[PDB]
Design a protein around this ligand. Structure first.
Ligand SMILES: *[C@@H]1O[C@H](CO)[C@@H](O[C@@H]2O[C@H](CO)[C@@H](O)[C@H](O)[C@H]2NC(C)=O)[C@H](O)[C@H]1NC(C)=O
Ligand SMILES: *[C@@H]1O[C@H](CO)[C@@H](O[C@@H]2O[C@H](CO)[C@@H](O)[C@H](O)[C@H]2NC(C)=O)[C@H](O)[C@H]1NC(C)=O
Ligand SMILES: *[C@@H]1O[C@H](CO)[C@@H](O)[C@H](O)[C@H]1NC(C)=O
Lengths: 33, 50, 33
């Protein structure tokens, strides 16, 4: 689950049946340097 | 007969709501109806998030 | 070939007729800062 396959929209309220999870940021190792 | 004609229509409806559109193409697949509707919105042109 | 409009899947032997070239990366300039 990277941000390349996702588009954030709204918040965690209107959605029904959502699940908590983590979404990897593909920049963190590249941000470290 | 009207009985099994209505049965055929019931099969059509059940496959449409539950299995998505796949049953007429391959094998029926359980898949949420809400997510099926979101996929249809993606089909028409509006993003499923709406 | 920007990495923005390109994506990766798998290794470099399963595919057929592949060629050799580095894919351009857009994250190099700003990472140098
Ligand atoms: C997703 O995680 C968030 C984390 O904030 C959950 O929100 C709170 O989680 C804590 C966990 O200790 C609960 O005690 C609270 O009641 C939750 N709500 C609020 C308003 O604080 C959220 O519930 C989680 N959702 C799912 C579907 O797992
Ligand atoms: C692209 O370059 C790679 C690496 O040279 C080629 O794969 C083989 O890699 C091994 C180990 O690095 C080398 O010993 C071989 O000589 C490489 N093969 C060749 C034909 O050079 C890969 O074949 C190259 N692909 C193209 C299309 O030139
Ligand atoms: C493609 O065509 C070239 C030229 O005809 C040939 O040498 C080569 O073997 C063919 N196949 C691949 C995978 O390049």
């Amino acid at each position: 689950i990277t941000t390349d396959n996702t588009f954030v929209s709204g918040n965690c309220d209107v959605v029904i049946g959502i699940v908590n999870n983590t979404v990897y940021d593909p920049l963190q190792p590249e941000l470290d340097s | 007969t009207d009985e099994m004609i209505a049965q055929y229509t019931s099969a059509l409806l059940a496959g449409t709501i539950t299995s998505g559109w796949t049953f007429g193409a391959g094998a029926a697949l359980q898949i949420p109806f809400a997510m099926q509707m979101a996929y249809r919105f993606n089909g028409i042109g509006v993003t499923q998030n709406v």
